[PDB]
Design a binder for these strands. Sequence first.
RNA 1: AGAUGAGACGCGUUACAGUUAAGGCUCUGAAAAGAGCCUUAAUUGUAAAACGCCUAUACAGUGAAGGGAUAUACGCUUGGGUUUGUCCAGCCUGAGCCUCUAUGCCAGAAAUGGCGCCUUCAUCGUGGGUUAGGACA
DNA 2: CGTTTGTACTCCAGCGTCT
DNA 3: CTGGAGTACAAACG
Length: 525
Amino acid sequence: ELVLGIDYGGKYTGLAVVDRRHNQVLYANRLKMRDDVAGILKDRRKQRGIRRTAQTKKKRLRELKNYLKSIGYNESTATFETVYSLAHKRGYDYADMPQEWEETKRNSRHRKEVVKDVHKAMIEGRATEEQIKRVERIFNKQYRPKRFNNRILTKCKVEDNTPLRKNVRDLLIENIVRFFPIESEKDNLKDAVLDKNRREEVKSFFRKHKTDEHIRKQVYDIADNKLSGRTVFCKEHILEHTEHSKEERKVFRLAPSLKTKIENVLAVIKDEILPKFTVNKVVMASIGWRYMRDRLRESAGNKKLPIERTLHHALDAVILAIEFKMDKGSRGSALHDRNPLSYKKGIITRRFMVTEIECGKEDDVISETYREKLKEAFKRFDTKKGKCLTDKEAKEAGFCIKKNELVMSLKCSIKGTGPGQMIRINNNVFKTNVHNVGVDVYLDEKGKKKAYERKNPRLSKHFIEPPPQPNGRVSFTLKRRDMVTVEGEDAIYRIKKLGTSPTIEAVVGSDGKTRTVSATKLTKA
RNA sequence: AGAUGAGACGCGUUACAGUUAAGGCUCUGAAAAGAGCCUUAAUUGUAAAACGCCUAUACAGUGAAGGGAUAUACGCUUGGGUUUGUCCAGCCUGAGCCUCUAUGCCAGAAAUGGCGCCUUCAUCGUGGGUUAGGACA
DNA sequence: CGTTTGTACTCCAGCGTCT
DNA sequence: CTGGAGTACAAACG
C-alpha cells in the first residue's frame, strides 16, 4: 500500500513515499519552489504602468497636435510651442489646491496652474473660449478609463462572486453581535453603528458589558473604517459555515503566483514518482489546496484518486505518508535590460548620479576633475566601502547642482558587457542576457569540428554585431539546462552557461565549483 | 495578511538638435589674444523604451437625437486577439442575459435635475488592442 | 618553438508618491 | 538574481 505524502510549506516543501503495510520508506527529499521570486509580477506591473502611461501620453500629444493643426497653430508658431511644451507636464488633479499644499510636493505643479498657463498662452494667441475650453478638455481627458472597482473577484464558494466589505457591512456587524449576551439591544446597536448620527452611543456598550478589545476594534472597523477588501458572501455560507454538499461546482484557476510553486511541486512529482511508483493514497479547504487536488488527479491518470486532508520538513512528509528552481531564459521573460546604454565609437557609457556611486568604484568616471572631487569627498566624509552618498553629503555640493534637486550627474563606463550583447531597437541600445538560445556544432572539410552560438530568433534582426556563421554541416545542437556527457569522462554533466565553450555542472556531488568543456567534446546523455 | 488588478503624476535612461560654462588641441596675428575642432558639465526642445502578433466588418474625433439602477458593464454564459510547438494567467473585446459583482462627479434636504457615460445617424480621419510571467514539451 | 583554448577574478542589471 | 562579459594567466598541441 504505497502512500504519497505532501509536506507543502511556504519556503520549502517535503515529499515522501512510504508503504504503510511495512513502514518502508522508499523515497524522500526536500526542495524550494519560489524561483528567484514570483514577485517579479510586481516589476512586470510597474513596467506595464510605465508602458501604458507612455502610450496614453503619446496618444494625447498626437490628438492635441492634430487639433491645433486643425485650428491653424502650426509648429512654427510660438503658441503651438508654448502649449505643446506644457502638455508634457499636465500636473496632478486628485488633490485640489487651496502651507500644507506647498509642503506636499516640490515638482509636477498642479493641473489648474498648467491650464492657467494654457489660458495665458492662448489669449496671447488670439483664441476663442471654445478653443480654449477644448484644449482644457484635452488636458483633462481620460483615454484609458479608470476601471478599478470590481476587477479581481473572489468567486462563489462551494466552501471556504463575492461583494465588497463596503456594501454588506450590516452582515459583518451582525456577525459581531451574534455572540453577545444581550438580545434586545442587538437591533439598537445595529441602528447605532450604521447611522453616523448615532456614532456616540456605541461606546457605552464596551463599558456596560465589558467586551473584549478585539470586539471593540472590529466594531470600530465596521464603523466606516474597514471599507476595503472582499468578504466570503455568495449563494452559500452567507452567514454559516456548514460543510454539506461536497463538490457541487467545478474548480477554476483563480490564485495567481501560487500556480508557479504548485506546479513546481508537481514537476518533481511527475519526474520522480509517476514513472517509477504507483500510489494508492495521497495526503497533504483552501483554493490552492483544491487546485492542487485537481491537478494531482489530472496528472495521475485517475479522476477518483483519494486525496484527503530543514530535514524536519522531509520528516513531516514521511510522517504524513537541494533541488532549487530558477529561470529567466523563457519566452515570457525580458528580452533586454530596462535602462538603455550609450554605444558610441565602440565605447559603452551611461550617466549616473554622483550620489549613487560608492567607494568601491573610484576611477570608473570619465571626467577627471569630478573623479578627483569624488575621491576627495570620499576621504572627507565617513562614506567608506559600500556606502552611497546621501543628500546631507550632497549639501557639500558637486559642481552645478540641478535646477530641481541637489544632485549631479557624470558619465561612467560599464564593465561586464561586450559587443555581442548589443541590440539596437529604434534609436535605443540595450544589453541582453538572452542572446544565445543554442549551440550548433558543425563539422566540415577533413573533420574540423567547431561550434557556433545560435542567436535568439526574436532579436536576430536587431544585433549590432553581425552573427558569425561560416558554411558547414550541422551535426549537433545543444540547449541550456540539458543533460550532457564529456568525451573521456564517465560522469553526467548539466549546462549552466552556454556559448562557445559552455559552462557545465556536475549533476551530483558538486560543491559550487564549475568547469568548462568545448561543445565539440560534448554529447547529450 | 496578504493577493494580484486599473489609472496617472514625476524623477531617472537613450537618440538627434540648440544655448551657456570650463578645459585641451590646431591655424593665424605685431601682440593682446581672434577663429576653428574636440572633451566634460549645466540647461532647452523633440523623439524611443520590449521584439513581435492581431485588427480597416477595426479604431478615433466632431455634431445631432435618445437612454441612463425598469439600465448598463470592470458582471454571468459562450467565442475572439495577445497564441507560440501545446495549455494558461493578466489585459482588451464580439453576441445574449441580470443568478453573483459593481455603478463615478456637481447641485437640490429630498423627490429629482445636469455632467460624465452608452446606443443610433451624419461627417471627418488612421488609428487601436496586447506584449519585461508562468507550466509542459 | 607559437598559437589556442581552458581557468580565476571582477563586474553587470530602474526608482518614488497618490487614488 | 542568472546568464554572460572582458581580462590576466597557464598548459598544451602543430
